[PDB]
Design a protein around this ligand. Structure first.
Ligand SMILES: [Mg+2]
Ligand SMILES: [Mg+2]
Ligand SMILES: [Mg+2]
Ligand SMILES: [Mg+2]
Ligand SMILES: [Mg+2]
Ligand SMILES: [Mg+2]
Ligand SMILES: [Mg+2]
Ligand SMILES: [Mg+2]
Ligand SMILES: [Mg+2]
Ligand SMILES: [Mg+2]
Ligand SMILES: [Mg+2]
Ligand SMILES: [Mg+2]
Ligand SMILES: [Mg+2]
Ligand SMILES: [Mg+2]
Ligand SMILES: [Mg+2]
Ligand SMILES: [Mg+2]
Ligand SMILES: [Mg+2]
Ligand SMILES: [Mg+2]
Ligand SMILES: [Mg+2]
Ligand SMILES: [Mg+2]
Ligand SMILES: [Mg+2]
Lengths: 226, 134, 260
RNA sequence: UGAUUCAUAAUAACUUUUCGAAUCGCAUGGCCUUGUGCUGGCGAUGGUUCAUUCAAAUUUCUGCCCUAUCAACUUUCGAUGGUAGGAUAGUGGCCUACCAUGGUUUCAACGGGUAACGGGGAAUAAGGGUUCGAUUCCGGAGAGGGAGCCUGAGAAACGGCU
RNA sequence: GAAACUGCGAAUGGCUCAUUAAAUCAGUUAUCGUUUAUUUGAUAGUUCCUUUACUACAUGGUAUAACUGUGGUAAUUCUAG
């Protein structure tokens, strides 16, 4: 089968087609999230520790995490689960997923290197893939660059230069949750609106109570005369 | 000498859409169905606007001939005519180029084809190309 | 079935909108709003059909999205906003104000009022009740909750709402000898004074209304709207004053007015 | 209010504690300890409760074709009612538990047929009638047959799912 | 401004008359027997766990799509790491 191996701390990943099934009975009858040692997997993966994180069988059905059961069953999959993307709100689909137990009917395993071995793999460790996006929220930039509570995050924004041959410019994202005078003005407006709303309601209540007292005194005057 | 003698009945001034709207009665004896070019020119000269701020539509000519009755609009400016006037009738008057789209069937077929792709389809196209290469 | 309806068929529209039978299968279903669906007039029907200011519904939308129309002092850019009875429609361009009052045939009339009268409206009290924190409120016929009313205001009274600050300027009681605007039924649009109110505890209090030509008619109290004293109405009445001439006197008026 | 244990208020607490703006645009005024300090406009979108509107659900009275070669039907397994609970958005045998033995019928119940969706209406027009109404408007019901449910204010939805 | 997340709509319309004989439906009531998005109007100074133990309000947190990259299936508006 193929081994989709990913080394996430450089973000890099590649596939090794491993034939000669003496090497891949080390994977058999082991679930997802279980760790294996790479010496039995090969001489090139010597000292490495993989964690089985997923896989696809023949006929392409994915390994659902933590089913049991090295065969395929049809599950009623819901929202926020693997192996299903709902096309409506509240739509559940009876799809067939393949179990978490690794068997010989897999076409590809998914492995994550949780421990680098002795030798350096030619497509997993020597190469580093950069992250596509830097942080965008203010305090996420602050904890990315480790600054402080009070600092200008505007000066620490990761900018990327876009070159169209003749014209080169830079683009920076936005600072979501950025403390701005517009936000302070909006907060102040809401506080002032609550305060003057309560003041105007109390003034209307006091004026109405004066009216009620006047009508009560008039009614008492027009009743005591009788 | 041909006595086109256009007149405008039922005049309503509309500042809401910034125009004057009226019924165009065209008395054209010894003439059949004058044109809308002549009607727009001769309404432009009587309402003093411009040719391109005057809009005419209607003109069902009376049985037996010699009279055509329609509707007319004279906008306060050409920009206010292009803002408020339908695109088909701007295309009629030459104020707008006709948009060249696909037909209705190919537009809806393209939409239903694009409903089957989640995302931009760059990854899907790369996977399909690589897998169909082997 | 299965949910709220969103289409109004033409021929299922209210008859007083005077929509032509042909030219489309559908009628403008009014939005939810201050007035009931069959007792309101949408802005597309007012602008396109009554005032003739727009030829299409596309032009009604083009009028409203420039914030030209305003109903009761607020802009109301909806095409099918339910402008009903007593509603003041101000068009700031063209400098004119309309009050949506019925004509005597039972139809909303194009009635131009002044800018002084456009600064207020009248509202029939639907309920007087105590709200939360013990605060009295009054509900008018156009859905307005008005807090802290006069304690003498009861149901079937008429308040005068100021349309800028929506308060009660004054009010009119429901007594015998006060003007009525009939807002429902086959006597809709008629104006007269209350002779007396017939009680009927259990349901449907009746009102005996007499107009200026001494023609008495009986109307349910849901359809009675007080508009002022004997004479001197608080609103400006439309042309015709709610008299309901018969059809013989109507053709007599037409032959006496078209012959010059 | 025709009428209430209504509206509403108060007291003692209760709560896998509900809401009480960490949202967006445009304009950038005003004041004096000139700090990018304090204030500040027109809106948009949210949001609790009441009212309104659009509704929905249930419901009173009265009205339906032919058939007795259909005279008794209902009550096992809710049929009529009472009490209490559960359930519901809510009334209610809607369901459950315990009691009572009721309820409908020659003024046609119950059953059978319908080549029956009901109505506004249509044809024929002395008057009365007779016949039609799947069909452009209103209401119902259904998405091949049944059943079950998700999401949602609203569906037992089928150009939603099992 | 594609994509995608979120929001709203998808419950309307349209079709058909199979079921259905106090059932639907019609006129008439009732909700003092209820739910109600939206619209419209009104509405919220009280937020402290057992105050003499508060943790930013010039404003808290992570976790995901789109995207990148590696794939499986002959195939689906399949989707996995
Ligand atoms: Mg933001
Ligand atoms: Mg429907
Ligand atoms: Mg509408
Ligand atoms: Mg109980
Ligand atoms: Mg009970
Ligand atoms: Mg029982
Ligand atoms: Mg049938
Ligand atoms: Mg005969
Ligand atoms: Mg029928
Ligand atoms: Mg029918
Ligand atoms: Mg049939
Ligand atoms: Mg129908
Ligand atoms: Mg259905
Ligand atoms: Mg079929
Ligand atoms: Mg079916
Ligand atoms: Mg929805
Ligand atoms: Mg279904
Ligand atoms: Mg279909
Ligand atoms: Mg459908
Ligand atoms: Mg969404
Ligand atoms: Mg909406």
């Amino acid at each position: 089968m193929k081994l989709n191996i990913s080394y996430p701390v450089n973000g890099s990943q590649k596939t090794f087609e491993i034939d000669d099934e003496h090497r891949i009975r080390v994977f058999f009858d082991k679930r997802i999230g279980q760790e294996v040692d790479g010496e039995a997997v090969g001489d090139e993966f010597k000292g490495y520790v993989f964690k089985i994180s997923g896989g696809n069988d023949k006929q392409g059905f994915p390994m659902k995490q933590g089913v049991l059961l090295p065969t395929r069953i049809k599950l009623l999959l819901t929202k926020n689960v693997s192996c299903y993307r709902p096309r409506r709100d509240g739509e559940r689909k009876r799809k067939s997923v393949r179990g978490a137990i690794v068997g010989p009917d897999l076409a590809v395993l998914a492995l994550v290197i949780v421990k680098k071995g002795e030798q350096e793999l030619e497509g997993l460790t020597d190469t580093t893939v950069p992250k596509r996006l830097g942080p965008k929220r203010a305090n996420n930039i602050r904890k990315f660059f480790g600054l402080s509570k009070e600092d200008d995050v505007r000066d620490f924004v990761i900018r990327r230069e876009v070159t169209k041959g003749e014209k080169t410019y830079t683009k920076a994202p936005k600072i979501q949750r950025l403390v701005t005078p517009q936000r302070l003005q909006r907060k102040r407006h809401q506080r002032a609106l609550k305060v003057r709303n309560a003041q105007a309601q109390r003034e209307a209540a006091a004026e109405y109570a004066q009216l009620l007292a006047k009508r009560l005194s008039e009614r008492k005057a027009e009743k005591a005369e009788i | 000498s041909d006595a086109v003698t256009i007149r405008t009945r039922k005049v309503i001034s509309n500042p809401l859409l910034a125009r004057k709207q009226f019924v165009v009665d065209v008395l054209h004896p010894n003439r059949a169905n004058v044109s809308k070019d002549e009607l727009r020119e001769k309404l432009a000269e009587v309402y003093k606007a411009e040719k391109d701020a005057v809009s005419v539509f209607g003109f069902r000519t009376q049985f037996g001939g010699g009279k055509s009755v329609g509707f007319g609009l004279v906008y306060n400016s050409v920009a206010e005519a292009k803002k408020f006037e339908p695109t088909y009738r701007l295309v009629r008057y030459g104020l707008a180029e006709k948009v060249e789209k696909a037909s209705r069937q190919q537009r809806k077929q393209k939409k239903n084809r694009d409903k089957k792709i989640f995302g931009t389809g760059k990854r899907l196209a790369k996977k399909v190309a690589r897998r169909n290469a082997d | 079935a299965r949910g709220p309806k969103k289409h109004l068929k033409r021929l299922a529209a209210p008859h007083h909108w005077l929509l032509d039978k042909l030219s489309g299968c559908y009628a403008p279903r009014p939005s939810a709003g201050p007035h009931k669906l069959r007792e309101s007039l949408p802005l597309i029907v007012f602008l396109r059909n009554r005032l003739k200011y727009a030829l299409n519904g596309r032009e009604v939308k083009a009028i409203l999205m420039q914030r030209h129309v305003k109903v009761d002092g607020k802009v109301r850019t909806d095409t099918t906003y339910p402008a009903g009875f007593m509603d003041v429609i101000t068009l700031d361009a063209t400098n004119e104000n309309f009050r949506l009052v019925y004509d005597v045939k039972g139809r909303f009339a194009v009635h131009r009022i002044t800018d002084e009268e456009a600064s207020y409206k009248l509202g029939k009290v639907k309920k007087v009740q105590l709200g939360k924190k013990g605060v009295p409120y009054v509900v008018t016929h156009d859905g307005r909750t008005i807090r802290y009313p006069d304690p003498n205001i009861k149901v079937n009274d008429t308040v005068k709402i100021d349309l800028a600050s929506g308060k009660i300027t004054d009010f009119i009681k429901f007594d015998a000898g006060k003007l009525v605007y009939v807002t429902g039924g086959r006597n809709l649009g008629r104006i007269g004074t209350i002779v007396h109110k017939e009680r009927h505890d259990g349901g449907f209090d009746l009102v005996h209304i007499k107009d200026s030509l001494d023609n008495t008619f009986v109307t349910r109290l849901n359809n009675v709207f007080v508009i002022g004293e004997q004479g001197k109405p608080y609103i400006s009445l439309p042309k015709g004053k709610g008299i309901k001439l018969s059809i013989a006197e109507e053709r007599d008026r037409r032959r006496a007015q078209q012959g010059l």
